[PDB]
CSV table of C-alpha atoms and ligand atoms in Angstrom, one decimal:
chain,number,residue,atom,x,y,z
A,2,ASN,CA,14.3,16.6,8.6
A,3,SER,CA,11.6,15.1,10.8
A,4,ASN,CA,12.9,13.1,13.9
A,5,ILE,CA,10.3,10.4,13.5
A,6,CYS,CA,9.6,7.7,10.7
A,7,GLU,CA,6.9,9.0,8.4
A,8,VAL,CA,5.4,5.5,8.2
A,9,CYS,CA,5.3,4.2,11.9
A,10,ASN,CA,5.8,7.5,13.7
A,11,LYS,CA,8.6,6.2,15.9
A,12,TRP,CA,12.2,7.3,16.4
A,13,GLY,CA,15.1,5.1,15.7
A,14,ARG,CA,17.7,4.5,13.0
A,15,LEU,CA,16.3,7.0,10.4
A,16,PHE,CA,17.3,7.8,6.8
A,17,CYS,CA,16.5,11.3,5.8
A,18,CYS,CA,15.2,12.4,2.4
A,19,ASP,CA,17.4,14.9,0.6
A,20,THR,CA,14.6,16.7,-1.2
A,21,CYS,CA,11.9,16.8,1.5
A,22,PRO,CA,11.9,16.8,5.3
A,23,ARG,CA,10.6,13.2,5.7
A,24,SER,CA,12.5,10.5,7.4
A,25,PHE,CA,12.3,6.6,7.4
A,26,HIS,CA,13.3,3.5,9.0
A,27,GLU,CA,15.1,1.3,6.4
A,28,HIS,CA,12.3,-1.3,6.0
A,29,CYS,CA,9.4,1.2,6.6
A,30,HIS,CA,10.2,2.9,3.3
A,31,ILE,CA,9.1,1.0,0.2
A,32,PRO,CA,11.2,0.0,-1.6
A,33,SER,CA,13.7,-0.5,1.4
A,34,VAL,CA,16.0,2.5,1.7
A,35,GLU,CA,18.7,2.2,-0.9
A,36,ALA,CA,22.4,1.4,0.3
A,37,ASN,CA,24.2,4.3,-1.3
A,38,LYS,CA,22.6,7.2,-3.4
A,39,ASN,CA,23.7,10.6,-2.3
A,40,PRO,CA,21.5,12.5,-2.7
A,41,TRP,CA,18.5,10.2,-1.9
A,42,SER,CA,14.9,11.1,-2.7
A,43,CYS,CA,12.0,9.2,-0.9
A,44,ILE,CA,9.0,7.7,-2.6
A,45,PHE,CA,6.9,10.8,-1.9
A,46,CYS,CA,9.4,12.8,-3.8
A,47,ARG,CA,9.7,10.3,-6.7
A,48,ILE,CA,5.9,10.3,-7.1
A,49,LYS,CA,5.7,14.1,-7.1
A,50,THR,CA,8.4,14.1,-9.9
A,51,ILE,CA,6.3,11.8,-12.1
A,52,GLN,CA,3.4,14.2,-11.7
A,53,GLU,CA,5.6,17.3,-12.4
A,54,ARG,CA,7.1,15.7,-15.6
A,55,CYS,CA,3.6,14.8,-16.9
A,56,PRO,CA,1.0,17.1,-15.6
A,57,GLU,CA,-1.7,15.5,-17.7
A,58,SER,CA,-1.1,12.3,-15.7
A,59,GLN,CA,-3.5,13.9,-13.1
A,60,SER,CA,-6.5,14.0,-15.4
A,61,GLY,CA,-9.2,11.5,-14.5
A,62,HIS,CA,-8.8,7.9,-15.5
A,63,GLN,CA,-11.2,4.9,-15.6
A,64,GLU,CA,-10.3,2.2,-13.0
A,65,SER,CA,-10.7,-0.5,-15.7
A,66,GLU,CA,-7.9,1.0,-17.8
A,67,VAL,CA,-5.6,1.5,-14.8
A,68,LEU,CA,-6.0,-2.1,-13.7
A,69,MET,CA,-4.9,-3.4,-17.1
A,70,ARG,CA,-1.7,-1.4,-17.2
A,71,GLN,CA,1.5,-3.4,-17.3
A,72,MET,CA,3.9,-3.0,-14.3
A,73,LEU,CA,6.4,-0.8,-16.0
A,74,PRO,CA,8.7,1.2,-13.6
A,75,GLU,CA,6.2,4.1,-13.0
A,76,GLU,CA,3.3,1.7,-12.2
A,77,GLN,CA,5.6,-0.4,-10.0
A,78,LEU,CA,6.5,2.8,-8.1
A,79,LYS,CA,2.8,3.9,-7.8
A,80,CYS,CA,1.9,0.5,-6.3
A,81,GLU,CA,4.8,0.6,-3.8
A,82,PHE,CA,3.6,4.1,-2.8
A,83,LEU,CA,0.0,2.9,-2.4
A,84,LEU,CA,1.2,0.0,-0.2
A,85,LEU,CA,3.2,2.4,1.9
A,86,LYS,CA,0.2,4.7,2.4
A,87,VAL,CA,-1.7,1.7,3.9
A,88,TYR,CA,1.3,0.9,6.3
A,89,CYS,CA,1.1,4.6,7.3
A,90,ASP,CA,-2.1,3.9,9.1
A,91,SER,CA,-1.6,2.3,12.5
A,92,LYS,CA,-4.5,-0.1,11.9
A,93,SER,CA,-2.4,-1.8,9.3
A,94,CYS,CA,-0.9,-3.8,12.0
A,95,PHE,CA,-3.8,-6.2,11.9
A,96,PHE,CA,-3.2,-7.0,8.3
A,97,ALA,CA,0.7,-7.0,8.1
A,98,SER,CA,1.6,-10.4,9.1
A,99,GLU,CA,0.4,-13.9,8.2
A,100,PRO,CA,-3.1,-14.5,9.8
A,101,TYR,CA,-4.6,-17.7,11.2
A,102,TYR,CA,-8.2,-18.7,11.5
A,103,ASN,CA,-9.8,-20.6,14.5
A,104,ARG,CA,-13.1,-19.0,15.4
A,105,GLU,CA,-16.3,-20.9,16.3
A,106,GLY,CA,-18.8,-20.6,13.5
A,107,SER,CA,-16.4,-19.4,10.8
A,108,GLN,CA,-14.1,-21.1,8.3
A,109,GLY,CA,-10.8,-19.4,7.2
A,110,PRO,CA,-10.4,-18.0,3.7
A,111,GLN,CA,-9.5,-20.2,0.7
A,112,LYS,CA,-6.7,-17.7,-0.2
A,113,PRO,CA,-5.1,-16.0,2.8
A,114,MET,CA,-3.4,-12.7,2.1
A,115,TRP,CA,-1.5,-10.1,4.1
A,116,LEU,CA,0.5,-6.9,3.6
A,117,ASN,CA,4.0,-8.3,4.1
A,118,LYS,CA,3.1,-10.9,1.4
A,119,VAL,CA,2.1,-8.2,-1.0
A,120,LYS,CA,5.3,-6.3,-0.1
A,121,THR,CA,7.5,-9.4,-0.9
A,122,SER,CA,5.5,-9.9,-4.1
A,123,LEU,CA,6.2,-6.4,-5.3
A,124,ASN,CA,9.9,-6.7,-4.3
A,125,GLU,CA,10.2,-9.9,-6.3
A,126,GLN,CA,8.4,-8.4,-9.4
A,127,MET,CA,5.6,-11.0,-9.2
A,128,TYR,CA,2.9,-8.7,-10.5
A,129,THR,CA,2.7,-8.2,-14.3
A,130,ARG,CA,-0.3,-5.8,-14.2
A,131,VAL,CA,-1.7,-3.3,-11.7
A,132,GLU,CA,-4.7,-5.5,-11.5
A,133,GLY,CA,-2.6,-8.3,-9.6
A,134,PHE,CA,-1.5,-5.9,-6.9
A,135,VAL,CA,-5.0,-4.4,-6.5
A,136,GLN,CA,-6.7,-7.8,-6.4
A,137,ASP,CA,-4.4,-9.0,-3.6
A,138,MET,CA,-4.9,-5.8,-1.6
A,139,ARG,CA,-8.7,-6.0,-1.8
A,140,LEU,CA,-8.6,-9.7,-0.9
A,141,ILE,CA,-7.0,-8.8,2.4
A,142,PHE,CA,-10.1,-6.8,3.5
A,143,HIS,CA,-12.6,-9.1,1.8
A,144,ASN,CA,-11.2,-12.2,3.7
A,145,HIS,CA,-11.4,-10.2,7.0
A,146,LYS,CA,-15.0,-9.2,6.4
A,147,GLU,CA,-16.1,-12.7,5.6
A,148,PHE,CA,-14.3,-14.4,8.5
A,149,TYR,CA,-15.4,-11.9,11.2
A,150,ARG,CA,-19.1,-12.0,10.1
A,151,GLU,CA,-21.0,-10.0,12.7
A,152,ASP,CA,-18.2,-9.4,15.2
A,153,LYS,CA,-17.6,-5.6,15.5
A,154,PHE,CA,-13.9,-6.4,14.6
A,155,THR,CA,-15.1,-6.5,11.0
A,156,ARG,CA,-15.0,-2.8,11.1
A,157,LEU,CA,-11.2,-2.7,11.1
A,158,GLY,CA,-11.3,-4.2,7.5
A,159,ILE,CA,-13.7,-1.5,6.4
A,160,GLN,CA,-11.5,1.2,7.8
A,161,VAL,CA,-8.2,0.1,6.3
A,162,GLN,CA,-9.9,-0.7,3.0
A,163,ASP,CA,-11.2,2.9,2.9
A,164,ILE,CA,-7.6,4.1,3.3
A,165,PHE,CA,-6.5,1.9,0.5
A,166,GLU,CA,-9.3,2.9,-1.8
A,167,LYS,CA,-8.9,6.7,-1.2
A,168,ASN,CA,-5.2,6.5,-1.9
A,169,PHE,CA,-5.8,4.3,-5.0
A,170,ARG,CA,-8.1,7.0,-6.4
A,171,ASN,CA,-5.5,9.7,-5.6
A,172,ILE,CA,-2.3,8.0,-6.8
A,173,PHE,CA,-3.8,6.6,-10.0
A,174,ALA,CA,-5.9,9.8,-10.6
A,175,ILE,CA,-9.2,7.9,-10.9
A,176,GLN,CA,-12.0,10.1,-12.4
A,177,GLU,CA,-14.1,11.6,-9.6
A,178,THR,CA,-17.7,10.5,-9.4
A,179,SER,CA,-20.8,10.8,-7.2
B,1,LIG,ZN1,9.2,3.3,10.7
B,2,LIG,ZN1,11.2,13.1,0.1
B,3,LIG,ZN1,3.7,14.8,-20.3
């Protein structure tokens, strides 16, 4: 197994996947690494199993259909995995914890949002459809772009949104387009 966390790339108290060489801090994995379970398989491995059990699940889909899906266990898992792919990027630090807004010439957003809040909402089964999870994720970056206006810091929202959107298209097998 790897000797660093797959998510944050640091050493520490690591839990090792039984079916692949990845390792994780307890609260870096999503969901948080399960108490018992020998063997244990990470979220990467659980997603790959879904695909292997239903190869047709990789055929192209329309985003509008994916958003309307109810949050049954496979969709729950796919959203957890997508959230974890965003935490995998180091620039997620800027969007992890609760923001505050005091900048001359700007007003904070009406509905603040952040990654740890989405993480808690998934854990608590607060989303009934994929659409709820995706709307809160996109709101994080939209809030950032609107608040930072012409400051070059706006670019961090574009960058992490691009990670989100590429992983969304991959995980949910969105039909490729020009
Ligand atoms: Zn970690
Ligand atoms: Zn694994
Ligand atoms: Zn099938």
